[PDB]
Write a protein that binds this ligand. Structure first.
Ligand SMILES: COCCCOc1cc(C[C@@H](C[C@H](N)[C@@H](O)C[C@H](C(=O)NCC(C)(C)C(N)=O)C(C)C)C(C)C)ccc1OC
Ligand SMILES: *[C@H]1O[C@H](CO)[C@@H](O)[C@H](O)[C@H]1NC(C)=O
Length: 338
């Protein structure tokens, strides 16, 4: 590990508080793509110009065309990426990628099969996995490992800032090689990784209102920058939602809008601190009418072993807590976002 003097930032766009993505350039000349920097996975991929137009998601997104890049290097190994809410398939390719001023030769997947659900609902084109090589499909070296190999980043860490963006403001920000003191206050508090190669930590309990109603025996929390909400197993969530008086729909839970401001606080016991969210933090309070339903930013999601079962702390959590991902010391640090 050779540290340097550099830190780079990528400005992110906030789409309706559910999708946070930035931009990257691939090839020569650069072909730009909107990508989610996802700590939940470790591969980089973008739709390919070889994706059948019968996949409507390929008709609606930017496609990488190897035939227009002079820095492209062929590989072709098949690759299938299975995420908890969708799958993409294609083959491996290599080219130079620019991420916030840093230029790195990276192997990424050219996706040729991209399902309408959920990709037709994606504002982003692709993904830049921020996880460890242990979780990389095909054992492909993750982009951050490749940047760290260059010995330019001041620190072997990267940080996330997600705004409550609502027209002339910064949707979010990723800092490669450190954090931005301008977006958090107080001190960072850390929790060591409960495992090797996954941004997952031990969670001591989850409380709703008065007491620790859930995760009483301890549980796992995966800090997922590529997730819109805080999710837990169906069991946990049914019990949580029971406590909230929320009603279960097909893909989410709602509450009569007038009841929203009434909902209790929900805390997550991580390491030495309690991380508390008020209803305002987890309710999409779009109305105060008892005649309208307001969705909650907390969902049920069952991740299978060996990673799951596990809670996933997504944008709902990150919006309140600036997050630093420390590879050097295998821990995650949270600070109050500002
Ligand atoms: C915060 O805004 C980011 C985008 C949110 O919106 C979407 C997120 C996804 C899923 C994420 C990916 C997940 N965050 C994923 O990383 C979750 C993890 C996962 O499935 N990882 C994949 C691997 C292969 C590592 C695995 N199965 O373990 C789980 C283990 C938590 C995208 C980056 C593809 C799909 C569609 C979306 O909007 C239309
Ligand atoms: C492409 O990539 C892998 C490394 O992930 C390499 O070792 C493999 O042999 C390459 N194959 C081809 C056909 O280029």
């Amino acid at each position: 590990l050779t540290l340097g003097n550099t830190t780079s930032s990528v400005i992110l766009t906030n789409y309706m508080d559910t999708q946070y993505y930035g931009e990257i350039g691939i090839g020569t000349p650069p072909q730009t793509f909107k990508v989610v920097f996802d700590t939940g996975s470790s591969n980089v991929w973008v739709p390919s110009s070889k994706c059948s137009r019968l996949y409507t998601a390929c008709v609606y997104h930017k496609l990488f065309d190897a035939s227009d890049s002079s820095s492209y290097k062929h590989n072709g190994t098949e690759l299938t990426l299975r995420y908890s809410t969708g799958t993409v398939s294609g083959f491996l390719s290599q080219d130079i990628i620019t991420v916030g001023g840093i230029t790195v030769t990276q192997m990424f997947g050219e996706v040729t099969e991209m399902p309408a659900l959920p990709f037709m609902l994606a504002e982003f084109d692709g993904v830049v996995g921020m996880g460890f090589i242990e979780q990389a499909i095909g054992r492909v070296t993750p982009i951050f490992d490749n940047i760290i190999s260059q010995g330019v980043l001041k620190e072997d860490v990267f940080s996330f800032y997600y705004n409550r963006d609502s027209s002339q403001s910064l949707g979010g920000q990723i800092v490669l090689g450190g954090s931005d003191p301008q977006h958090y206050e107080g001190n960072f508090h850390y929790i060591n990784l409960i495992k090797t190669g996954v941004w997952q930590i031990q969670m001591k309990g989850v409380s709703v209102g008065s007491s620790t109603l859930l995760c009483e025996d301890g549980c796992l929390a995966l800090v997922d920058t590529g997730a819109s909400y805080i999710s837990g197993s169906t069991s946990s969530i049914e019990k949580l939602m029971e406590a909230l008086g929320a009603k279960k729909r097909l893909f989410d839970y709602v509450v009569k809008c007038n009841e929203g401001p009434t909902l209790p606080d929900i805390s997550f016991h991580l390491g030495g601190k309690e991380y508390t969210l008020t209803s305002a933090d987890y309710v999409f309070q779009e109305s105060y009418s008892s005649k309208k339903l307001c969705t909650l930013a907390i969902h049920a999601m069952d991740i299978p072993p060996p990673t799951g079962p596990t809670w996933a702390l997504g944008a709902t959590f990150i919006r309140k807590f600036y997050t630093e991902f420390d590879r050097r010391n295998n821990r995650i640090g949270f600070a109050l976002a500002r």
